[PDB]
A paper describes a structure:
As typical for a clade 2 Cld, its distal arginine 127 is hydrogen-bonded to glutamine 74. The latter has been exchanged with either glutamate (Q74E) to arrest R127 in a salt bridge or valine ([name]) that mirrors the setting in clade 1 Clds. The [name] variant mirrors the situation in the clade 1 representative NdCld and should exhibit an increased flexibility of R127 compared to that of wild-type [name], whereas Q74E might arrest the catalytic amino acid by forming a salt bridge. By contrast, in clade 1 Clds the corresponding residue [Q123 in NdCld] turns away from R173 due to a different conformation of this loop (loop colored blue). We provide the crystal structures of [name] and Q74E and demonstrate the impact of the mutations and pH on heme coordination and active site architecture by ultraviolet–visible (UV–vis), electron paramagnetic resonance (EPR), and electronic circular dichroism (ECD) spectroscopy. Besides heme coordination, the mutations are shown to have a strong impact on the thermal stability of the heme cavity but an only weak effect on the chlorite degradation activity. The conformational dynamics of R127 is shown to have a significant role in heme coordination during the alkaline transition and in the thermal stability of the heme cavity, whereas its impact on the catalytic efficiency of chlorite degradation is relatively small.
Chlorite dismutases (Clds) are heme b-containing oxidoreductases that can decompose chlorite to chloride and molecular oxygen. The two clades exhibit differences in (i) oligomerization, with clade 1 proteins being homopenta- or homohexamers6−10 and clade 2 representatives forming homodimers,11−14 and (ii) subunit structure, with “long” clade 1 Clds being composed of an N-terminal and a C-terminal heme b-carrying ferredoxin-like domain and “short” clade 2 proteins lacking the α-helices of the N-terminal domain. The only charged amino acid in the hydrophobic distal heme cavity is a fully conserved arginine (R173 in NdCld and R127 in [name]), which is proposed to be flexible and to switch between two conformations during catalysis, i.e., pointing toward either the heme iron (“in”) or the substrate entry channel (“out”).4,6,8,11,14,16 Importantly, the hydrogen-bonding network of this catalytic arginine is different in clade 1 and clade 2 Clds. In clade 2 Clds, R127 is H-bonded to Q74 located on a flexible α-helical loop, which in general connects the N-terminal and C-terminal ferredoxin-like domains in porphyrin-binding α + β barrel proteins.
Numbering used by the authors:
A (entry chain B), B (entry chain A): 1 to 182
């Protein structure tokens, strides 16, 4: 299997763009669809507005008991019912990346309860975390969420709780690409 | 700045290959020299035998007090006297990468005291850690050490201690490329 994923905003793809919300910092040009490829894409179709990419990686913060709680409720991607998705690219500040591992873990979970909060929205919400700072990309992470319409309200609630977190004080660019499965 | 480094084994470079010691698992072909480039190289050069690459990244394990101690004593790269170097590509097992963050930190420092042991030798040894599992490379890490002859015996003692640690029970491929500055 290949750990690289590419998200190309343009006129083709498996996902229709519903809405792009430019939450913080420079946004992303509106496009019609998102095409998702499991691999690297050196050059995009010239009818494409942007390309984002990241890799699936190892665990950086979650501890064993947290992983065991997640595994108990985590849903799979590509559920038939999960016709809504959101792609949320995120960039954190240089101050964050300069911090040591204990400092970042303390903000992520002991102060912000990132995993404990997210667990409350499983199994409704399926997700994929990709990393891209080490690729030299403009964002540091591509986060992906998908779910049935019955969980839209809960997901909006989750977003409000996260954006109010200490961890968010270090986010410096964020965009939401709302999607509907074709 | 560019976070990517390539190490090309072949007939050109800043470092002469003294010997290659294929410590564990498949080795690396003997070559005359190692060429180090602060950038990606798309393909292995025609007459070169291999191309290793990795990126400099954020801290994964060290805590603030450890980083303070390290940053206070580590020497700069390219000291006049640091005419010896060793490039040690390392691969860890799938069992390692499936462990959680607390499980890996506990092996890396609580059990093995990797940083505390390294610190004993670090005043005279300049180091660079690079990551490459996430690039799809055959190794997980490229580690780089350079020092004066005066520190050769001490560096071998460090290697003796590290290969006996709990951490290295998870190393599954390792090569030593011993070098001398041209
Ligand atoms: C839906 C429930 C969620 C759960 C269960 C959850 C869980 C997790 C876990 C366990 C990690 C740590 C992975 C590791 O240790 O490497 C993580 C990372 C991350 N999550 Fe969430 N998450 C959820 C929702 C969200 C949302 C809604 C966002 C964005 C608004 C988000 C953004 C991120 C980011 C940016 C990271 C990377 C943090 C870093 O490495 O600095 N998560 N998530
Ligand atoms: C010379 C003194 C040394 C010091 C001060 C030292 C220090 C460190 C530190 C602080 C890290 C963790 C960086 C982080 O938190 O991400 C690290 C990682 C690593 N070091 Fe060393 N080290 C030394 C020698 C060595 C040697 C001789 C080897 C190889 C034989 C080695 C192989 C590694 C590897 C493979 C990693 C990555 C571990 C992982 O992420 O699983 N180190 N080192």
């Amino acid at each position: 299997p290949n750990n690289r994923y590419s998200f190309i905003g343009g006129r083709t793809g498996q996902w229709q763009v519903v809405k792009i919300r430019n939450v913080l910092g420079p946004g992303l040009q509106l496009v019609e669809k998102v095409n998702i490829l499991n691999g690297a894409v050196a050059e995009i179709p010239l009818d494409s507005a942007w390309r984002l990419q990241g890799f699936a990686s190892n665990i950086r913060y979650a501890i064993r008991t947290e992983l065991e709680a997640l595994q108990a409720v985590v849903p799979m991607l590509n559920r038939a019912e999960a016709i809504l998705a959101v792609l949320i690219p995120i960039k954190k500040s240089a101050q964050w990346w300069e911090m040591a591992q204990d400092e970042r873990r303390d903000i992520f979970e002991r102060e912000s309860h990132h995993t404990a909060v997210g667990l409350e929205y499983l199994p409704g919400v399926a997700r994929r975390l990709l990393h891209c700072r080490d690729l030299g990309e403009e964002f540091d992470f591509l986060t992906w969420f998908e779910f049935a319409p019955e969980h839209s309200s809960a997901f909006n609630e989750l977003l409000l709780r996260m954006r109010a977190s200490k961890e968010w004080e270090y986010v410096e660019r964020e965009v939401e690409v709302w999607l509907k499965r074709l």
